[PDB]
């Protein structure tokens, strides 16, 4: 705690190791996805998501970004299949973006950086008691990643953007209800998967990543709305959340599997 990690030139991605030595681990995320080197695994099942909109509960400004939190006391909203034998409980969705509208994703494909990224995170309810315990275990979390390509406005995002007006500053929160994050996912069921980590402190190597093969659109004015939120508390001078995307890390011999 007493966290002074951010994305600035002084507390940014290239300084994290000073305080989080795992930052130089062997299973760090994100990574670049070389489609010439992926490996077709025929045991991969089709991913299946089953979310209850009644479980959406709040939206909050965390300073470096904003999170949409879900009620995780039940198995009412879960993800199964893909490479898993158990079910993962949904707890949140959030986004990553850059200071420019063309280069802001976390994962890259064939060395190409997209405009932004959606992350829909889940924890292993079949193996651990709470999110807190699982967060640091190897099979603890499962995150779905969807690359966002700048283009035509994405109507599906509207409810999330309208909501932003109530969480302008750090630590504000607001009720966010009746919403199914599966409405945000692309049609396609194909994907890439690899073992990695959290893309920001504490950087635990506890995530089994699911990268969707199809990207979704977003427009420049949509992205400018993200960039307009502030990281300061209310009453202070305005500091815009300009970017929150970490650089891709070395594979260190991990294998990216593909469902196709």
Closest distance of CB 31 from Zn ion, Å: 14
Angle at 16 between CA 253 and CA 6, to 5 degrees: 125
Say whether 119 counts as a known binding-site residue.
yes
Q: How far is the CB of 186 from Hg ion (least distance, A)?
A: 6
Q: For 110-260, where are the alpha helices, taking DSSP H only?
A: 131-134, 158-164, 220-226
Q: Shortest approach of Zn ion to residue 94 CB, angstroms?
A: 5
Count, residues near Hg ion per rule CB under 5 A: 8
By CB under 5 A, is residue 119 in contact with Zn ion? yes
Task: Judge whether 40 is annotated as a binding position.
Answer: no
Residue 95, CA distances (Å) to 68, 78, 216, 231, 250 in order = 10, 20, 13, 15, 22
Q: Does 243 bind Zn ion (CB under 5 A)?
A: no
Asked if 208 touches Hg ion (CB under 5 A), the answer is no
CA 11, CA 3: separation in Å to the nearest integer? 10
Active site residue 40: no
199 is in an annotated binding site: yes
Footprint (CB under 5 A) of Hg ion, residues 122-151: 146-147
Token pair, residue 74, equals: 């039940």
Neighbouring C-beta atoms of residue 111, cutoff 10 Å: 9
Task: Say how many Å lie between the first and final Cα of the chain, rounded.
Answer: 42
67 binds Zn ion (CB under 5 A): no
Considering only 118-126, 133-141, 202-210, 227-235, which stretch makes contact with Zn ion by CB under 5 A?
118-126
Q: Does the protein bind Zn ion through residue 122 (CB under 5 A)?
A: no
> Applying CB under 5 A, which part among 111-119, 165-173, 181-189, 232-240 lies near Zn ion?
111-119
Q: How far is the CB of 142 from Zn ion (least distance, A)?
A: 13
Sign of CA dihedral 73, 74, 75, 77: negative
Q: According to the binding rule CB under 5 A, does residue 215 interact with Hg ion?
A: yes
Cis peptide bond upstream of 45, omega within 30: no
Contacts with 234 (C-beta within 8 Å, 6 or more apart), sequence order: 168, 169, 172
Write out the binding residues for Hg ion, residues 29-48 only, by CB under 5 A.
47
Q: Which residues are catalytic?
A: 64
Instruction: Enumerate binding residues for Hg ion (CB under 5 A).
Output: 47, 146-147, 185, 189, 191, 212, 215
Known binding residues? 64, 67, 94, 96, 119, 199-200
């Amino acid at each position: 705690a007493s966290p002074d990690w951010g994305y600035d030139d002084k507390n940014g991605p290239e300084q994290w190791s000073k305080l989080y030595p795992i930052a130089n681990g062997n299973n760090q995320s994100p990574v670049d996805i070389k489609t010439s080197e992926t490996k077709h695994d025929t045991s991969l099942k089709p991913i299946s998501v089953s979310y209850n909109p009644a479980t959406a509960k709040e939206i909050i400004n965390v300073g470096h970004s904003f999170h949409v939190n879900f009620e995780d006391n039940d198995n009412r909203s879960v993800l199964k299949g893909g490479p898993f034998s158990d079910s993962y409980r949904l707890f949140q969705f959030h986004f990553h973006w850059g200071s420019t509208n063309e280069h802001g994703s976390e994962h890259t494909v064939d060395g190409v950086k997209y405009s932004a990224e959606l992350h829909v995170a889940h924890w292993n309810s079949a193996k651990y008691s709470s999110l807190a315990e699982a967060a640091s275990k190897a099979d603890g979390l499962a995150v779905i990643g969807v690359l966002m390509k700048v283009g035509e406005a994405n109507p599906k995002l509207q409810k999330v953007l309208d909501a932003l007006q109530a969480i302008k500053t750090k630590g504000k929160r607001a009720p966010f209800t009746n919403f199914d994050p599966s409405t945000l996912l692309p049609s396609s069921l194909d994907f890439w998967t690899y073992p990695g980590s959290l893309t920001h402190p504490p950087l635990y190597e506890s995530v089994t990543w699911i990268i969707c093969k199809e990207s979704i659109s977003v427009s420049s004015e949509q992205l400018a709305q993200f960039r307009s939120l502030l990281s300061n508390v209310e009453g202070d001078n305005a500091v815009p959340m300009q970017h929150n995307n970490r650089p891709t890390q070395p594979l260190k011999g991990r294998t990216v599997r593909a469902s196709f």
